[PDB]
Ligand binder design. Sequence first.
Ligand code: S4B
Ligand code: S4B
Lengths: 116, 115, 115, 116
Amino acid sequence: CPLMVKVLDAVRGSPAINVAVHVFRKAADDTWEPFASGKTSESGELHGLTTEEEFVEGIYKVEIDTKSYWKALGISPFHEHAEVVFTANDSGPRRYTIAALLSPYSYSTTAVVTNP
Amino acid sequence: CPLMVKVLDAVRGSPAINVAVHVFRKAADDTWEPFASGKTSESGELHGLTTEEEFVEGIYKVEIDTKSYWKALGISPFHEHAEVVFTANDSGPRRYTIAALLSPYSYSTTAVVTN
Amino acid sequence: CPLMVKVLDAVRGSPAINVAVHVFRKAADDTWEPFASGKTSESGELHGLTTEEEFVEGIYKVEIDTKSYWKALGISPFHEHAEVVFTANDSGPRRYTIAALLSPYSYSTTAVVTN
Amino acid sequence: CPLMVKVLDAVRGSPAINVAVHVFRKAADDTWEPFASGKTSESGELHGLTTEEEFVEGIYKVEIDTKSYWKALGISPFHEHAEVVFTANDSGPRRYTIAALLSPYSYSTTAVVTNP
Ligand SMILES: OB(O)c1ccc(/C=C/c2cc(O)cc(O)c2)cc1
Ligand SMILES: OB(O)c1ccc(/C=C/c2cc(O)cc(O)c2)cc1
């Protein structure tokens, strides 16, 4: 798994389950092209977004749909979503974990980048 | 001052000074149009971005140029920038502070919304 | 004001008001002796804890009563309190702001140390 | 594993490896008694601190030695350590993950609490 997303809920102390995630990749014309999407599992994890072959060098945006997550719990949150934008694989293939910790008016995000 | 942005450095324990910040408002065609911008002060703060009259309900994006900040310090960072996207809502008098706490591979952001 | 404490609420997007805060200084016997305390203001801030003369180098603990804050809101929290333990060091004129951003099962804290 | 600790490094974008962790439990006389200790692995995880039988109801403190971690990397950090204090198992047995994300002048901590 070259790219994994993990989402946690800071209000409930739980994984954030069924969170929609959309990944885009910047194209040659500077537009964002759809690249992959999915939703988090019962463990707050989203695996299988892409493959080693498909995950080439580029600028990627990981959009986490936090607003829909909170609304389903009856909370009206501040943000529309949480976006994570980064250059990937420009020094060769790496494994990326994008983690986010969510609250209704705040979020934290970090990356764990490893060389296989 | 209906909108203020505050940026802090989690590595050095200081305000993040001279950081470029751009604010955009979502247009009817779903495109991001420039709304306001500036550079954070010595206290890591950016004031005077807009006025009560101009800051109507809508979807706004605050883009913080974190990459340039870390590069200026010789530190290789993860993110191209930090983006904060939110809806402004009229529900009594509201002032919005968007705060961001920066590290090379991580950031936190919160909103402090007061009367 | 060599030491200020600022507490924010990540659930409601507001200052955390009327939060009890206790500051301790580590004694020679390795026990925590009370140093200063108060309750955060309407802006989530606690000023006037100490003076330049009293705030000497040493190890300090700031304890924030997060549990009472969440209980007052009907929310069951994880932590008994939030504790921030640090050394004050003389290295030119320093002012310390200890900030904390609170959620029911999580908190972030940072130090803003300036001249 | 009723109690696990996970530590991440926000400067390097990596697990925080070889971080010392000490767990204490409040005794009847209100003193902190040593309960368990260990250090994080190459994945930033610390498993096997305790057992279901030993991890009874109580108030626990998890002390993460962040200062020693940073000093070994040549950084002089702000905090002495990061402390996490919580009541455990007072509504019956739960599984606890205590996570922390570290920077030299800041840290974030969250808990993931699950019912097996
Ligand atoms: O079970 B796991 O593999 C696991 C469990 C918890 C985390 C938490 C990460 C995290 C991210 C943040 O942005 C802030 C924070 O305090 C913690 C990661 C992996
Ligand atoms: O105008 B002020 O006096 C002010 C306003 C907001 C902050 C926010 C701090 C903060 C701390 C964290 O640990 C995490 C985070 O996202 C933000 C600080 C000072």
